[PDB]
Amino acid sequence: GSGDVCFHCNRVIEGDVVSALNKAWCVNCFACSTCNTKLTLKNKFVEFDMKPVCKKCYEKFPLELKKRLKKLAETLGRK
Template sequence: MSSTIDGQPLRWRGDTFHPYHFNCASCGSELTADAREVKSRPGYTANDMNELYCLRCHDKMGIPICGACRRPIEERVVTALGKHWHVEHFVCAKCEKPFMGNHHYERKGLAYCETHYHELFGNLCFICNTVIYGDVVTALNKAWCQHHFACATCDTKMTQKTKFFEFDQKPSTSR
């Protein structure tokens, strides 16, 4: 016979229960709805030794908590931005796609994929106004793509080492 669960139920192995029917596997205290399930322990396979712990005992176990979902991480862990993450929860702050082991860029406590990092924080070419990937030519407090850095008067391609003068806030090889 089942009875109605008043308050928050305890979810364990896909079912819901009255929390007071369970005790912490470590300290023996009666559990509440915020009990944590540890799916496997050293020497056991997953689901061979599922146990429930009160929050206090669970925290003492040192199992990392995901910075996104606030649930325990019992498989692969990503450590970044001073937090731990489930692999699928460590995502770009702009597009929300998981990095899944790919490189990420950090800015002001957030992680970005390469595309969105450059889009939001990268150098824009003074001529074409697009994000510059690769080498940036910086001169006259402006940034250029390598192939757009040219003399403003004769359109000759220049490099960082080319001598030039400022003409109308643009580089020029002649006076």
């Protein structure tokens, strides 16, 4: 309930602002782009290719690749 505009839909956050890619994302719009699983600050997820990825998908990548994809969310994720 901060009041940011979920860059995912460009509309005022209707729930919690999921800071992704340093932008504000709706918990309703932000969803594992690899599973369509609704993303929530309580659920486990990561940023990949500028898209959300559930921890299960982040695990579907080779151990040496996930550490590289996680490198994205580290700077292109929560701020």
